[PDB]
Antibody
Framework: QVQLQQPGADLVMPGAPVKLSCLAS????????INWVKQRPGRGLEWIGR????????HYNQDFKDKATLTVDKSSSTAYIQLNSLTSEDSAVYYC??????????WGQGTLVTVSAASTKGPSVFPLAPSSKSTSGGTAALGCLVKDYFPEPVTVSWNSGALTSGVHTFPAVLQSSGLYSLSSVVTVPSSSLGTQTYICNVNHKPSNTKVDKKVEPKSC | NIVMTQSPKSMYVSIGERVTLSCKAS??????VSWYQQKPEQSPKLLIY???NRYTGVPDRFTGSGSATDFTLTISSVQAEDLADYHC?????????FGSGTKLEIKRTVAAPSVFIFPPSDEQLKSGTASVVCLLNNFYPREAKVQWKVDNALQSGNSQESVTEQDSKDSTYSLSSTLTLSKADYEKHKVYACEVTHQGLSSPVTKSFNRGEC
C-alpha cells in the first residue's frame, strides 16, 4: 500500500512562492527518487525534477532549474517542490511520482495550482429565455448564464435536482477580466413551457452565492 | 530535447475494435518509451514500461512494441474503461519527455446540430453588458463552427465558445458561442445572426434575432 499523494489545490497571486508536498506509504523514503511533473490544462505532461531522499541529490529540468527547488524530508517522509515567483502561465496541476526503476510506477493525486490576482466575487445569473419561435419543433431551449465569478466552482442544478435530463452545464471560461463565465442549458418540450415551471439553481460557494433564478418564456 | 511525437492527436474508435496509437522519438531512445493511461479526473497510470512490458495489473488486452524511433500502443479491443487519454513517455536522456498525448473517443453516426439564439436579458443590459449566446445542440463529430454576424458585419475576437465532451448517453457534443459587447455598442445594431457550419448540415444554418420584434 505504498502510495504517495499530494494536497487538493490552492490559489495564489502572481510572483508568489508556493510549497507542495508528497508522501511515502511503506517501502523507504530513501529507496527511490521522486519526480515532479507539470501537467498544464489540455497539454502533455512536462518534467520538472528528481531529488534523492538521502543525499538529497537533485536533477532539475533545465527549464525549471532557476524557478523551482526540490526540497526534501527524511525526517517526515515527504518531498516538497517550491516555485519562486509564479506567473499566470504557471497555473497547472502538479504531480510527484515514485520512480520505481528509471520509470514512474506509482504517482499521487494532482495538486491544482491556480495563479490569479482576482478577488473572490459572486456570479450573476441571467435568463436564457425560451427559444421556440421556428424552434417550436417539439422541444424548445432555455438556460442560465452565470457570469463573472471567482473562483471555481459554481454548481448548477435545475429544479433542486428534479430535472436531470437534457441539462448541459457547459465548462466555465476565463474572460479577459480574470472572472469566469459558465452557462447551463436544458432542452425541454415546446408544449411544457407553461405546462411546467423551470428554475435553475446556481451556487458559487466561496462568495457564498446561492441564487435561484427562474427562466420562463419571453414576452416577445 | 528528445522530442516525442504522438499520432493521431485524437482518434474515434468503436467499442470492441483493435486500435493502434503512434509515437516516434526524435533521436533513438532504445526501447525506453513507456505508456500512461489517464482518465480526466485521474492522474496518469503506467500500463507499459520498457518498450513492451505490461506493467503489473495491466490487462492482456494492452500490448506494446517498438525499437528505436517508432513505437505503438495497441489496445487489442476497446471497452468502456479503455476510452481515455494516452501519453507516450521516455526516460533514457535528461530531461525525460512526454508526447502531447492522444484522446480516445467512441464513434457513431453524424448528427446535424440544433441551433438556438438567445437575446441578452434586460437585467444583464442595465449594468453595461450584452451577452448573446448561440446554442449548437447535440451534433457529431466535434468539428463544428459558429459564425457571428452583427448587421451583416463579421465579428472577430469578441466571442468565446465552449464545448462539452461526449454525452454519456447519446455520445454527442455541444457548444456555446457567447458574444459580448457593451449595452451601447449593442443598441447600435438591430440584427444579430449566428451561422453554424457543420459536416452534418447540407448548408450552414443561421439563427437570427432583432432587438424589439420577434
Amino acid at each position: 500500500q505504498v502510495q504517495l499523494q499530494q494536497p487538493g489545490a490552492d490559489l495564489v497571486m502572481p510572483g508568489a512562492p508556493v510549497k507542495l508536498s508528497c508522501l511515502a506509504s511503506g517501502y523507504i523514503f530513501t529507496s527511490s527518487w521522486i519526480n515532479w511533473v507539470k501537467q498544464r490544462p489540455g497539454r502533455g505532461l512536462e518534467w520538472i525534477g528528481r531529488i534523492d531522499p538521502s543525499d538529497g541529490e537533485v536533477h532539475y529540468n533545465q527549464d525549471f532549474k532557476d524557478k523551482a527547488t526540490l526540497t526534501v524530508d527524511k525526517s517526515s517522509s515527504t518531498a516538497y517542490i517550491q516555485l519562486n515567483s509564479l506567473t499566470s502561465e504557471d497555473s497547472a496541476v502538479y504531480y510527484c511520482a515514485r520512480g520505481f526503476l528509471p520509470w514512474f510506477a506509482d504517482w499521487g493525486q494532482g495538486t491544482l495550482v491556480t495563479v490569479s490576482a482576482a478577488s473572490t466575487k459572486g456570479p450573476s445569473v441571467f435568463p436564457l429565455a425560451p427559444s421556440s419561435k421556428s424552434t417550436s419543433g417539439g422541444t424548445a431551449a432555455l438556460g442560465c448564464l452565470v457570469k463573472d465569478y471567482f473562483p471555481e466552482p459554481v454548481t448548477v442544478s435545475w429544479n433542486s435536482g428534479a430535472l436531470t435530463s437534457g441539462v448541459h452545464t457547459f465548462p466555465a471560461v476565463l474572460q479577459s477580466s480574470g472572472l469566469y463565465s459558465l452557462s447551463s442549458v436544458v432542452t425541454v418540450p415546446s408544449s411544457s413551457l407553461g405546462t411546467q415551471t423551470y428554475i435553475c439553481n446556481v451556487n458559487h460557494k466561496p462568495s457564498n452565492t446561492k441564487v435561484d433564478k427562474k427562466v420562463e418564456p419571453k414576452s416577445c | 530535447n528528445i522530442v516525442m511525437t504522438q499520432s493521431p492527436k485524437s482518434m474515434y474508435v468503436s467499442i470492441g475494435e483493435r486500435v493502434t496509437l503512434s509515437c516516434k522519438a526524435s533521436e533513438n531512445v532504445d526501447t525506453y518509451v513507456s505508456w500512461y493511461q489517464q482518465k480526466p479526473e485521474q492522474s496518469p497510470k503506467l500500463l507499459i514500461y520498457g518498450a513492451s512490458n505490461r506493467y503489473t495489473g495491466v490487462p492482456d488486452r494492452f500490448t506494446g512494441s517498438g525499437s528505436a524511433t517508432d513505437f505503438t500502443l495497441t489496445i487489442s479491443s476497446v471497452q468502456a474503461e479503455d476510452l481515455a487519454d494516452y501519453h507516450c513517455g521516455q526516460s533514457y536522456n535528461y530531461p525525460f519527455t512526454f508526447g502531447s498525448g492522444t484522446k480516445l473517443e467512441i464513434k457513431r453516426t453524424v448528427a446535424a446540430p440544433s441551433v438556438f439564439i438567445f437575446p441578452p436579458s434586460d437585467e444583464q443590459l442595465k449594468s453595461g453588458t450584452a451577452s448573446v449566446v448561440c446554442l449548437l445542440n447535440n451534433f457529431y463529430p466535434r468539428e463544428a463552427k459558429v459564425q457571428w454576424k452583427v448587421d451583416n458585419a463579421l465579428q472577430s475576437g469578441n466571442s468565446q465558445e465552449s464545448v462539452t465532451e461526449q454525452d454519456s448517453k447519446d455520445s454527442t457534443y455541444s457548444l456555446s458561442s457567447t458574444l459580448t459587447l457593451s449595452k451601447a455598442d449593442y443598441e447600435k445594431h438591430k440584427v444579430y445572426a449566428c451561422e453554424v457550419t457543420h459536416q452534418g448540415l447540407s448548408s450552414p444554418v443561421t439563427k437570427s434575432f432583432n432587438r424589439g420584434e420577434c
